[PDB]
């Protein structure tokens, strides 16, 4: 069943497709074969090229894949930043992992912690699903 973070996904699903909300969902987590994985997800995006049920009924978990906007698996050194239909990826240093919302330039300050940004905000979702889910919600 649903708990905070899959109700958080469908609470903003409207929105993100309409494109009034543009949410980064940071999750990270394991992948199935014992590494850890993180990344951010565009969650509009996927909304578009996915149909979520799968994710709203327990089907599958959402997780990070490579080809999400930005995607760590340190046990397999990987780490890519392949940006996304809605986020660039503008930097990643000490000062912070800043993404670029295309529509209306505004920078994201995506690290787990951080202070968002113009027009985003930052929240920690507590859920059993993952060991750390944030989402950034930024209002074009
Ligand atoms: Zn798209
Ligand atoms: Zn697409
Ligand atoms: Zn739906
Ligand atoms: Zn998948
Ligand atoms: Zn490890
Ligand atoms: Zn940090
Ligand atoms: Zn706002």
Same mark, same amino acid.
């Given at each position: 069943s649903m708990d905070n973070f899959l109700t958080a996904l469908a609470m903003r699903e409207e /929105? =993100? &497709?309409?494109?009034?909300?543009?949410?980064?969902i940071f999750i990270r987590d394991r992948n199935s074969h014992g590494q850890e994985i993180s990344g951010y997800?565009?969650?509009?995006? &996927?909304?578009? $090229?996915?149909? %979520?049920?799968?994710? %709203? $009924?327990? *089907? *599958?978990? #959402? #997780?990070? &894949?490579? $080809?999400?906007?930005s995607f760590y698996n340190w046990?397999? /050194?990987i780490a890519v930043s392949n940006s996304?239909? =809605?986020?660039?990826?503008?930097? /990643?240093?000490?000062?912070? #992992? #800043? %993404?670029?919302y295309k529509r209306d330039r *505004?920078?994201? =300050?995506?690290?787990?912690?951080?202070?968002?940004g113009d027009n985003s905000t930052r929240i920690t979702i507590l859920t059993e699903l993952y060991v750390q889910a944030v989402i950034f919600d930024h209002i074009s």
């Open positions: /929105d =993100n &497709r309409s494109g009034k909300l543009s949410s980064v997800i565009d969650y509009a995006h &996927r909304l578009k $090229t996915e149909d %979520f049920e799968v994710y %709203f $009924t327990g *089907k *599958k978990r #959402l #997780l990070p &894949r490579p $080809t999400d906007i046990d397999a /050194d996304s239909p =809605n986020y660039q990826v503008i930097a /990643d240093n000490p000062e912070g #992992l #800043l %993404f670029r *505004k920078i994201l =300050n995506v690290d787990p912690k951080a202070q968002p």
